Amino acid sequence: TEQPSPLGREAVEQFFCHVRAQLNIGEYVKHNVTPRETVLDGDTAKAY
Amino acid sequence: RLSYSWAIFINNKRCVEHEFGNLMKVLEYGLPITEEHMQFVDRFVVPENY
Amino acid sequence: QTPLPVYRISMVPTGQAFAALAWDDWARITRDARLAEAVVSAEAAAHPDHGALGRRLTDRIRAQGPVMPPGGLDAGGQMYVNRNEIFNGALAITNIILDLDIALKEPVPFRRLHEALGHFRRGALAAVQLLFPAARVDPDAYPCYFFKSACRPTDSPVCSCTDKIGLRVCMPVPAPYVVHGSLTMRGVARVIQQAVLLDRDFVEAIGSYVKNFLLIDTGVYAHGHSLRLPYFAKIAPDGPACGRLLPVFVIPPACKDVPAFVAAHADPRRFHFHAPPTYLASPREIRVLHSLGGDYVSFFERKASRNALEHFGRRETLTEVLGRYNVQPDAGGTVEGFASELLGRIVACIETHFPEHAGEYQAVSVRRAVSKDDWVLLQLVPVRGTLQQSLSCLRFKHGRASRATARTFVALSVG
Amino acid sequence: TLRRVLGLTTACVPEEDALTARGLMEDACDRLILDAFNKRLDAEYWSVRVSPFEASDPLPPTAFRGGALLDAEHYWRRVVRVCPGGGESVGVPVDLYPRPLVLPPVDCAHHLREILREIELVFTGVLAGVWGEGGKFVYPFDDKMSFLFA
Ligand SMILES: Cc1nc(N(C)C(=O)Cc2ccc(-c3ccccn3)cc2)sc1S(N)(=O)=O
Numbered sequence: 124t125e126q127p128s129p130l131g132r133e134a135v136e137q138f139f140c141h142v143r144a145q146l147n148i149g150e151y152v153k154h155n156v157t158p159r160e161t162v163l164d165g166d167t168a169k170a171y
Numbered sequence: 172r173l174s175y176s177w178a179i180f181i182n183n184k185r186c187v188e189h190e191f192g193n194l195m196k197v198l199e200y201g202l203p204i205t206e207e208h209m210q211f212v213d214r215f216v217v218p219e220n221y
Numbered sequence: 222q223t224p225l226p227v228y229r230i231s232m233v234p235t236g237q238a239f240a241a242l243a244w245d246d247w248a249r250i251t252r253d254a255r256l257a258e259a260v261v262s263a264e265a266a267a268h269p270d271h272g273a274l275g276r277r278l279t280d281r282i283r284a285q286g287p288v289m290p291p292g293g294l295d296a297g298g299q300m301y302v303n304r305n306e307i308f309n310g311a312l313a314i315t316n317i318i319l320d321l322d323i324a325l326k327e328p329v330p331f332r333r334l335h336e337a338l339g340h341f342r343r344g345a346l347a348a349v350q351l352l353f354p355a356a357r358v359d360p361d362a363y364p365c366y367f368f369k370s371a372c373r374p375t376d377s378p379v380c381s382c383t384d385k386i387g388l389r390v391c392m393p394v395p396a397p398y399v400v401h402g403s404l405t406m407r408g409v410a411r412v413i414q415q416a417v418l419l420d421r422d423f424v425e426a427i428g429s430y431v432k433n434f435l436l437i438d439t440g441v442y443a444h445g446h447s448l449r450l451p452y453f454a455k456i457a458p459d460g461p462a463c464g465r466l467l468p469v470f471v472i473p474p475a476c477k478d479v480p481a482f483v484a485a486h487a488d489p490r491r492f493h494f495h496a497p498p499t500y501l502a503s504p505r506e507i508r509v510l511h512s513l514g515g516d517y518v519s520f521f522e523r524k525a526s527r528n529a530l531e532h533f534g535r536r537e538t539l540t541e542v543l544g545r546y547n548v549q550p551d552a553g554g555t556v557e558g559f560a561s562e563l564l565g566r567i568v569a570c571i572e573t574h575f576p577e578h579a580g581e582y583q584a585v586s587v588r589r590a591v592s593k594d595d596w597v598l599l600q601l602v603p604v605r606g607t608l609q610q611s612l613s614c615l616r617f618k619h620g621r622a623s624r625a626t627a628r629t630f631v632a633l634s635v636g
Numbered sequence: 637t638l639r640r641v642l643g644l645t646t647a648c649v650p651e652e653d654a655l656t657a658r659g660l661m662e663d664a665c666d667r668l669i670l671d672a673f674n675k676r677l678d679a680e681y682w683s684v685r686v687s688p689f690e691a692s693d694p695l696p697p698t699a700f701r702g703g704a705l706l707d708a709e710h711y712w713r714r715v716v717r718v719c720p721g722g723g724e725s726v727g728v729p730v731d732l733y734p735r736p737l738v739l740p741p742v743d744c745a746h747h748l749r750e751i752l753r754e755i756e757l758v759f760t761g762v763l764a765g766v767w768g769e770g771g772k773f774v775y776p777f778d779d780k781m782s783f784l785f786a
């Protein structure tokens with residue numbers, strides 16, 4: 124009455140997946156920043 | 172050839188507190204000292220004549 | 222015509238001076254480190270390869286500016302020997318400036334350094350392209366400017382740095398973007414450092430001699446902080462000046478005009494924080510990037526904190542504990558009354574354990590000194606009449622005449 | 637803006653209309669703030685009137701040196717607000733000084749917030765009445781356009 128062990132799948136699917144994303148520049152930028160920008164057009168651009 | 176002949180045991184079996192364990196790790200591994208540790212260690216002080 | 226630059230000058234032997242300038246003579250400052258057009262043209266004609274061209278130009282420039290004579294005592298004569306620019310928090314930023322400090326354990330040659338710089342130039346451009354997505358940045362033609370320090374604390378001149386290497390890198394913000402704030406610049410610098418570290422060639426080429434992999438310092442962008450400028454020496458404790466920042470030429474692979482790139486290194490508008498932009502006709506529309514987020518707090522900290530909370534249980538803050546006693550940390554006097562009430566036990570303990578210093582604390586008053594989220598520090602003021610105005614040290618017995626003044630504080634914490 | 641919204645109301649459209657309406661409202665506010673940037677150096681434009689029966693700021697001592705300009709002060713007093721240092725927000729009585737003036741940067745966030753509250757007071761009622769909604773109108777001034785005047 125032995126059964127398959129859920130000790131390896133859980134850890135791999137839960138924790139080690141984030142490190143691979145951490146080890147990429149593109150993924151780093153995608154995940155670790157949130158920018159905010161505003162557009163100025165006309166005479167306000169020159170004034171600013 | 173000490174690189175192929177070295178084993179290291181980590182973990183401590185008796186510690187049940189958080190801040191004490193963090194302070195012990197900081198002291199053992201030579202990490203920088205911050206103000207949180209200084210504030211924590213202030214609970215044990217008493218006058219010498221005591 | 223305002224706005225103007227403001228500079229901080231370090232005097233010899235001690236002291237400081239300040240300058241606020243409307244215009245200056247920049248031909249005299251950079252006069253001794255310029256290459257004639259004919260020399261550059263002939264040298265370029267001789268050598269077709271870019272790396273050899275850059276190395277030869279750097280070798281020729283190195284032995285041109287011999288020294289700068291020391292200036293006078295008056296601040297008006299020493300401003301040409303030392304100068305640092307001050308960050309202003311009410312103006313926009315139009316230049317990315319990085320200060321690289323490298324600590325090495327084994328001396329390194331010059332060609333290795335040149336190759337490392339050539340490899341460093343590539344990942345920063347990719348990070349910049351990722352950060353600014355509405356602009357076209359060509360990695361094979363964008364310019365980046367490199368300045369390196371002096372030596373004293375066909376082969377190119379010897380490099381004999383003792384223990385450290387200092388560099389400055391300058392590159393413009395791609396159009397039509399602008400930056401605003403002090404946290405945004407720190408975010409940009411951290412992203413650039415992470416991008417450069419993940420590169421493979423750079424780590425292989427420079428990883429041997431370097432001790433640790435912490436290159437960029439992100440603490441130079443704050444309101445009031447100052448940073449040193451190229452072409453100026455750094456005063457030393459002994460007095461002699463040393464360590465002039467002078468250029469190092471790293472030609473882009475696909476540069477179409479070498480003379481323009483060489484001559485642009487002496488433009489005072491390329492190494493200032495808030496210098497006006499260099500456009501062509503006029504801006505039709507401009508986008509301001511006015512925030513990148515809050516703090517970093519890496520993943521390894523958030524996950525560890527969550528695990529600790531789930532495993533060991535919760536812990537309250539100082540505010541809830543103080544409220545349990547019916548006292549708040551706001552309004553000042555609410556906690557001051559609590560301190561006044563508690564003063565009795567403190568005085569009794571002082572009397573019991575330090576008998577000699579007992580009549581000093583008969584009457585006192587409490588004033589706020591410092592407050593934070595989980596720690597408060599109040600001062601004990603000796604009202605107005607105590608005979609002995611200044612309190613004495615409770616630990617040692619200082620000299621009879623040397624009645625050194627000691628200040629007494631009460632600290633509150635959750636504990 | 638009210639004219640535009642009520643003109644659009646005659647499109648006989650479901651709840652979606654309300655959403656559309658909301659969009660228009662926000663747009664208007666945006667433009668207003670941008671237009672106020674070009675008048676940031678005007679002191680009389682931003683000044684506000686105060687009556688004897690209300691509370692006002694204390695009078696700076698220098699105002700007592702004006703001379704013959706203090707004679708025409710029957711009823712009203714006009715006041716502006718400036719920031720000379722960090723967060724100070726000091727006041728200034730405009731009419732007691734000889735012209736022209738020399739002042740630090742004006743305080744525009746304070747006045748703009750004061751105006752925006754009254755602006756929203758009417759849009760909220762229009763939304764709740766015409767379409768029978770339940771959501772107030774709120775404009776995110778602090779996270780969208782507060783960098784202009786900082
Ligand atoms: C939620 C959690 N419980 C954790 N335990 C049980 C521990 O550290 C246990 C320990 C391990 C080593 C030491 C030690 C003591 C002296 C010198 C070096 N080392 C002390 C205690 S760790 C984490 S966490 N937040 O990393 O996931």
Ligand SMILES: [Zn+2]
Nearest residue numbers: 371372380382
């Ligand atoms: Zn060197």
Ligand SMILES: [Zn+2]
Nearest residue numbers: 614617619625
């Ligand atoms: Zn002492």
